[PDB]
Amino acid sequence: DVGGLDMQKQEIREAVELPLVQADLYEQIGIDPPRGVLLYGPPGTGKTMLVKAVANSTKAAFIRVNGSEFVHKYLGEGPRMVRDVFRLARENAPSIIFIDEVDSIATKRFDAQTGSDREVQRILIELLTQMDGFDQSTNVKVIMATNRADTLDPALLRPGRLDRKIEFPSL
Amino acid sequence: KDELRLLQEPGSYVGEVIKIVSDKKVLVKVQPEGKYIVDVAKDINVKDLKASQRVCLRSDSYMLHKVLENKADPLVSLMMVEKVPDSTYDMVGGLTKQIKEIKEVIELPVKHPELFESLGIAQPKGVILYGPPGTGKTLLARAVAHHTDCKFIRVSGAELVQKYIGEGSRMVRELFVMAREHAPSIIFMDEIDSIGSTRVEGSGGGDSEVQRTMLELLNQLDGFETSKNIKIIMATNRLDILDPALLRPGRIDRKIEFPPPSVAARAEILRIHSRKMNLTRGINLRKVAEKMNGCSGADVKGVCTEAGMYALRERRIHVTQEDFELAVGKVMNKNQET
Amino acid sequence: VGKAAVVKTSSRQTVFLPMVGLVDPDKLKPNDLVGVNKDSYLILDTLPSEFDSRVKAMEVDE
Amino acid sequence: FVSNSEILKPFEKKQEEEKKQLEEIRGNPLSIGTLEEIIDDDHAIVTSPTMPDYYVSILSFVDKELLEPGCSVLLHHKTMSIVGVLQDDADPMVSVMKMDKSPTESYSDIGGLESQIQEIKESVELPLTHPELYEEMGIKPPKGVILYGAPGTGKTLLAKAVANQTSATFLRIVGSELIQKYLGDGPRLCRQIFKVAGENAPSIVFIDEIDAIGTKRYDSNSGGEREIQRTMLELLNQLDGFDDRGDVKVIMATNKIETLDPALIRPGRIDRKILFENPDLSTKKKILGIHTSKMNLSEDVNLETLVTTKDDLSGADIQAMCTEAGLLALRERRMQVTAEDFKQAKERVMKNKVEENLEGLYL
Amino acid sequence: LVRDAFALAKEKAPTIIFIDELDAIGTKRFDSEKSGDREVQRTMLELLNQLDGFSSDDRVKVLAATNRVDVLDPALLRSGRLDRKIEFPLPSEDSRAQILQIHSRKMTTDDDINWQELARSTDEFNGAQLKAVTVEAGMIALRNGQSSVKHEDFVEGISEVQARKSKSVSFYA
Amino acid sequence: LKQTENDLKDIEARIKEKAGVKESDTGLAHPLQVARCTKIIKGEDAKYVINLKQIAKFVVGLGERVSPTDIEEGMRVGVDRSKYNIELPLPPRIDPSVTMMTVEEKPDVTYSDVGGCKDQIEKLREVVELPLLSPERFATLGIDPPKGILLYGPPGTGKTLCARAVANRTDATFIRVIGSELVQKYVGEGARMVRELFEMARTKKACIIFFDEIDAVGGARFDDGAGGDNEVQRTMLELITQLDGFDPRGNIKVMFATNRPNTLDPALLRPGRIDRKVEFSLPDLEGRANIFRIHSKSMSVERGIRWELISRLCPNSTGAELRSVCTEAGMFAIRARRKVATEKDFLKAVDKVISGYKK
C-alpha cells in the first residue's frame, strides 16, 4: 500500500514467504531457512503497516513482542514469558513474532542499579537461547527492528541466525 | 472393568520418606502440607523405606499408597535431563585444536576415570571456553553429551532466578540434589557466556545477588557429595562480576581457547557446509578462505546463506562459483561495519 | 447486573447473587456489616452498626 | 542371635500375652504435631504442619516432664490426642543441615600453614583437648572464629583440618540461608543451631560463604535486609547464653568484617582472626609429596626442581599442576610423567590455566 | 474513618474533622502506589463525596495538618475544601516568650521570672520543644541547691546544658 | 507401671477423649490457643459465635454482656488477633513466655565493664536516681521527671550493665524485656507483655521497666503499622494510655534501648513521653584502668604488673573490647608456657586489638 518499497518487496518475500512456504527450495540448495530479518530506521515507515500486511499473505500468526513490553517488577517472569511464547511457536509453523524498538532489549548494563531495575540482562537469556542456543530452524518469524543503536552489541547482530539487514532509505 | 476402578480413584500425590517407626507407621514429608505420619501399606515393607525415598501417598485417607523409583524430580523449568540429543562434531567442528582439547579435558576423565586415578591425580570437572565472538560452541555442548553417551543438562539462570524469596536458592538446590543420582551427565550453565555464540555479557544486577547462593552449592559436589563424572561446562571471555576466586580447583580446572579462524582452520569449515549444500564443479574452497580475515562461525553460515539467495534468483538447485564471489563481497562489508 | 449485587466476604471469596427484597440498595454499602451465610455466602439481611472497625489509637474528644 | 535368644527373647515371652496386645491399642491411624503448652490436667495444644490448631487431651504414656513444648510428638488422626512423644528432629530446625563425620583434611595436608595451625588450635582444639590451660587462668576460650581468604584454600582446608584432630562431626551451615527475609525466621534458625549440638556436644558448628547476613547495609535493598538487623542482634544473646568447655565451636567465614554489627562481634567472645598468608617454600613441597607418591617420577624430576620457579600458588593450585603434568603423559601414552611435561605444565597452569601475568610498573 | 468521622457529625450539632500527617495519604508524588494499598486511595475518594454532601452547612468542617506540601490537587482547591495554605514555621524570638510564660504558670516558681529576657537565649524551638526546656531548666535547681526554681536557674538551662559539643573544646585548646 | 499405662487408652482415655476432643470439636469446632464455632443459634445474650481464624470473621451485636468466667458453652472461647465487642473479658493470655521475662530486684552489679561510666550515671542521676529516692523533692520544684528515658550509643554495649548500676543506689527492681523475643507467631504478644509490666509496677513502688531491643518493636512496623495485624500497633497504646494518663510519673518509670533514634516512631519521639536521650561514651584512662583490675582478680597474673599502663596504650574502647584485652592476655602466655600473664602479655594483647581491628 506504500510506494517506493520495491527494494524491500524482493527482500520481504525471500525472508518471510519463502521460509514459511517455499522453504523446501532451501533444502534443494542445502541451507537452512532464515530465522528472521533485521530492520533499521524509526518506526512508521515500511515497518508497522507493512509487516502487519505481510502476515496476511503468508497466513501466519502475527504476535507483537516489543522491547518495552513484558516490563514489570517481578524478577524472572520477563524471560519466563519469553520461554513460553517461543515454545508454542515451535509447534505452530505459521507464526510471526515482530519486535519493535529492539534497542530497549539490546541495551546492556553500564551501572549497578541495586534495587529497581535489574532486568536489563535477564531478557537476553531466553531470547538468545531460542535463537543462538538451538540449531538453525524456522518454526516462527522473528523480526527485530532496530530504532537507535550505536555501541550496543548484544550479539543479535551479524548473520548468526537472522539473515537480511534492512535499512530504511534516507534519500 | 478398569473404567470403574481408575475413574473412581480420588488421586494420590508423591512424598519423601523421613524416618521409619517400629509401630508399622512411617513419616512422609508432604510438599503442600508437611511432615505427616501415615500407615505403611500391607504390600509395602516398612524396613525397605530409606531416607528421602520417593513413595506415593493417597489423598483420600492420607496414608501410604505405593512406592516409586528413587530419583530427584523437582519443579522443572528447562531442567529436564535428556539423552544423546541431535548434534555432531562435523557441523560445529573444523578446527583441530578445538576438538583435540575436548578429548583431553572431557573424553578422557569422563569415559575412563581410572586414567587419572592410576596416577594418583585429580581429573578436571570443569572447563572455561574462550576465543573471539562467533564461535558456535553452544551447539558443540550438545555434541559432547551425544557422542560420549552421557546425559545433557542445560542450566538457564533466567528460569532459576525469580523475585520470590528462596527462588535463588531452592532452584539451585534442585540442581544440587539432581546431580547426586544423575552425576554421570554433563551440565551447561547460561547467563555467564561471553564467548559470542550466546552472549549476554554477564549481568550486573542479576549476578550481584544469586552469586552467593549458587557458587557455594556447586563446590559442595567435590567437598560434600564427593561425586565424580560431573562435567561443568562454563564459558566467559572475562572475569568481572563473578567470583574472582573461581580459579581454584574443583570449579575451574582446564581452559580451552578457541583458536583464531585462520585460513587453514576455515578451509575445513567451508567443507562442512559443502557436504549438505549443493555446489557446482571447479569451486576452490581454500581460495575463499584467503579472501577474508578473521571470519567467525556466524559469518560462515551467513555467507553460505547469501550464496543460496543468488541461486534462487537463477532457479538452480546448485550454487555456481559466480554466486560465491558475489556472496563473499557482501559478507566482507557486513563484517567490516561495527 | 442492575438487580444483582456483588458482595465480597472476609474469606477472600466473591459471590454473585441477585438482590432480595429483604435488603435495600441504600443499606448495602462497603465497609458495613452485612450478615451472610457461612457456607453458601448468601446475603440475608443487613445488621445495625455495632463494630465499625473504629481504628483505635484515635483521639476522640467532645 | 544365640545370646539374644536365651536372654532377650525369654524376657518378652512372659510379656507376650500383654506387651504384644497392649501396643496395638494405639492403632495404625496416628499423626504428628508440635507441642505448645503443657499442664497437669492432661490437656495440651498441638499443631500439625497444616495448622489445625486444636485443644486436645493427653493420654498416659510418659510423665509431663518428658513433654517439651516445641518438639514433635506422636498424635492421633481424628481425635488429635497426645498418645506419646517422639524425637524433635522432625522440626524444621535449620534449612541446610549437613553432619560430616571424620573430615578428610588434616593439619599435615594443608602445607606450610603450621604457623597458623598452632594459632587456630588455641582457640578451638586446645580448649576441647586441654581446657585446664584456660581453667587455671580463669578465662573463657573464644567461641567464634573469623575466616578470610578464598574458598578451597583458607576458607575450606582450615575448616576441615581442625575438625579432624578434635574427633568432632563437621556441621556445615550456609550463611546465606540464615536469612529468610521473613520476620521470626531469623532468630528461629539461629537458636536451633546450638540445640542440635548442645545435648551431648558431639559436633562443632561451622559456617562458610557469607555474602548476605554479613552486610545489612542501611535498608532492605542494595544487598542488605531488614531481617539481618534483628538476626545478628539476637544471635549475640545466643553466643553469651551458650556456655561449655569448648566441645562445640562456631567458625564463620566472611570477606569483610566492616559491614558486621559491632554488637554481634563483641570482642573477647571472638579472639580468633585468621588472615590469608602467602604459601612459603615448604607449602608446595608438602602438596607434591602426596601426589608424587602414587605418580612415578623420572630421574630428572626432584623436589627442588619443581619449587625453583613458583608464584607461591596455594596448596590447591599446586594439585592442579600435578594433574596437568599427568594429562601430558596421556598424550604420549605412558603412566610415568617425565621432566619434559612439568616444564610445559608450569607454563600452562600459571598462565593459560590461571590468568595473572603479573602486571608490573607498580601495580 | 471518612464515614466514621461523618457518622459522629450527624447527631452532634457542630463538627470539625482533623487529619494528622496529611502527606501520607495526600502526597502521591510520582507514584501510583495509592493503587497498591487501596486503603490510602479510597480514603481520598470518600472525602470527595463527603465534602460535597453539605455545601451550605457550616457545621461540617474537615481540616488537615502535616509537615510540608508537595503534590497539589486543584480539584481539592475550592470553597468548601482545603484551599488556603497556612504555614506554621518555627516561632520567632518574641513568639516563644508567651509560650514559656504559660509553662511557668502551670508550675510553681518564685514569680520573679521575666519571660521577655529568657526569649533571647532560645534558637529554633517549637511549642513542644519549649516544654522539654522547662523540664531541663528545673534540673538546674538541683545543681544550684535550691528548693524552688528561681529566674537564675532558667538562664543556665535555656542556653544548652545538654549534649552538643560540651566542654571538650572551650577557650583555647 | 509400663503395662499399666498401656491399656488406659481403652478405659480412662475413652472418657478423656470424649470430654476433651468430641466436646471441643462438636459442630465442626485450660489454656485456649484456638476457638471455633459453626452455625450456632442461641437467643444478643451469650451469642459468641466467633471464628479466631482470619477466614470468615464474625461480630457480636445487640447490647453488651460481661461474662469473664463462662461466656456461652465454655470449652473453646478465644479472641486472638481481632477483639470483637463483648469478647474482651476472656482474652487468651496463655503463652510459655516465662523464658523471655527477666526480673531482678535490687541487682548487685556495681562496676564490671561499666567502670568509668559515672558520667552517664550523672545523666541518669537527676531524672532516674532522684525520683526513685526522694520523689517529694519535685513537689517544691514544680516540675516532675519525664515519662521515658532514651538510651543511645554503640550497639550491644552500655545498655545492659549500666542500667543495673543505677538501680543499686535506688534499691529498685530492674525488669529487662527483650524486644526481639516479643515478636512471635502469636499476634499481640508485644502488647500483652507490656500490660503485665505496669500491673506489677503498681503493686511495688519505685520499679524500673526496661525494654531491650526496641527496634524490633518500636511504635510501628510493617506487619502492624503497614499490616492488618495488631501487635506493636496495640503496644504503643500501653505506653500512652497507661503510663502517661493513669500511672504517676514518680513511682513508675520506663526506659528503652536502641541503636538509632530514627528507627522508632516519630510520634513517640515527641515531648511528653520520650525526653531524656542518654548517649553512651567510652571509658577514659581512669575508667579503663578500673575495669582491668577487676578482671585481674579472677585471672591469674603477676603481682608486680601495673593496670594503669595497660589501659594507657589502648585508646577508647567499648565494654567488650576492654574484656578482650584480659582474655587475650592468657593466649600469649600459652606460647611462652606460663601459668600467669606477665606485663608483656597485656602489651601484646593491646597491639592485637589495635592492629587486628583498626577501628
Curated annotation (Swiss-Prot), chain A:
It is found in: Cytoplasm; Nucleus. ATP binds at residues 41-48. N-acetylated by NAT3. There is a cross-link at residue 108 (Glycyl lysine isopeptide (Lys-Gly) (interchain with G-Cter in ubiquitin)). Belongs to the AAA ATPase family. The 26S proteasome is involved in the ATP-dependent degradation of ubiquitinated proteins. The regulatory (or ATPase) complex confers ATP dependency and substrate specificity to the 26S complex. This is 26S proteasome regulatory subunit 6B homolog. It comes from Saccharomyces cerevisiae (strain ATCC 204508 / S288c).
Curated annotation (Swiss-Prot), chain B:
GO terms for molecular function: ATP binding; ATP hydrolysis activity; proteasome-activating activity; protein domain specific binding; ubiquitin protein ligase binding. The keyword Nucleotide-binding applies. N-acetylated by NAT1. ATP binds at residues 131-138. One of its GO terms (biological process) is chromatin remodeling. It comes from the Eukaryota. Its main location: cytoplasm. Keywords: Acetylation, ATP-binding, Cytoplasm, Nucleotide-binding, Nucleus, Proteasome. It is found in: Cytoplasm; Nucleus. One of its GO terms (cellular component) is proteasome complex. Present with 4700 molecules/cell in log phase SD medium. The 26S proteasome is involved in the ATP-dependent degradation of ubiquitinated proteins. The regulatory (or ATPase) complex confers ATP dependency and substrate specificity to the 26S complex. Belongs to the AAA ATPase family. May form a homodimer or a heterodimer with a related family member. Interacts with OLA1, TMA17, and UBR1. This is 26S proteasome regulatory subunit 8 homolog. The lineage of its organism: Eukaryota, Fungi, Dikarya, Ascomycota, Saccharomycotina. The gene is RPT6. The chain holds residues 59 to 396 of 405 of the full protein.
From Swiss-Prot, chain D:
It is found in: Cytoplasm; Nucleus. One of its GO terms (molecular function) is ATP hydrolysis activity. The keyword Oxidoreductase does not apply. One of its GO terms (cellular component) is cytoplasm. Keywords: ATP-binding, Cytoplasm, Isopeptide bond, Lipoprotein, Myristate, Nucleotide-binding, Nucleus, Proteasome, Ubl conjugation. ATP binds at residues 149-156. The keyword Magnesium does not apply. GO terms for biological process: nonfunctional rRNA decay; peptide catabolic process; positive regulation of protein catabolic process; proteasome regulatory particle assembly; proteasome-mediated ubiquitin-dependent protein catabolic process; protein-containing complex localization; ubiquitin-dependent protein catabolic process. Changing residue 155 to Q: 73% loss of ATPase activity. There is a cross-link at residues 160, 181, 216 (Glycyl lysine isopeptide (Lys-Gly) (interchain with G-Cter in ubiquitin)). Belongs to the AAA ATPase family. The 26S proteasome is involved in the ATP-dependent degradation of ubiquitinated proteins. The regulatory (or ATPase) complex confers ATP dependency and substrate specificity to the 26S complex. Has ATPase activity. This is 26S proteasome regulatory subunit 4 homolog. It comes from Saccharomyces cerevisiae (strain ATCC 204508 / S288c). The gene is RPT2. The chain holds residues 75 to 437 of 437 of the full protein.
Curated annotation (Swiss-Prot), chain F:
Gene3D superfamilies: 1.10.8.60, Nucleic acid-binding proteins, P-loop containing nucleotide triphosphate hydrolases. GO terms for biological process: positive regulation of protein catabolic process; positive regulation of RNA polymerase II transcription preinitiation complex assembly; proteasome regulatory particle assembly; proteasome-mediated ubiquitin-dependent protein catabolic process; ubiquitin-dependent protein catabolic process. InterPro entries: 26S_Proteasome_ATPase, AAA+_ATPase, AAA_lid_3, ATPase_AAA_core, ATPase_AAA_CS, NA-bd_OB-fold, P-loop_NTPase, PRS7-like_OB. Its main location: cytoplasm. The keyword Nucleotide-binding applies. Disulfide bonds: none annotated. Signal peptide: none annotated. GO terms for cellular component: cytoplasm; nucleus; proteasome complex; proteasome regulatory particle, base subcomplex. It is found in: Cytoplasm; Nucleus. Keywords: ATP-binding, Cytoplasm, Nucleotide-binding, Nucleus, Phosphoprotein, Proteasome. The modification Phosphoserine is found at residues 67, 134. Belongs to the AAA ATPase family. Interacts with UBR1 and CIC1. Present with 105 molecules/cell in log phase SD medium. This is 26S proteasome regulatory subunit 7 homolog. It comes from Saccharomyces cerevisiae (strain ATCC 204508 / S288c).
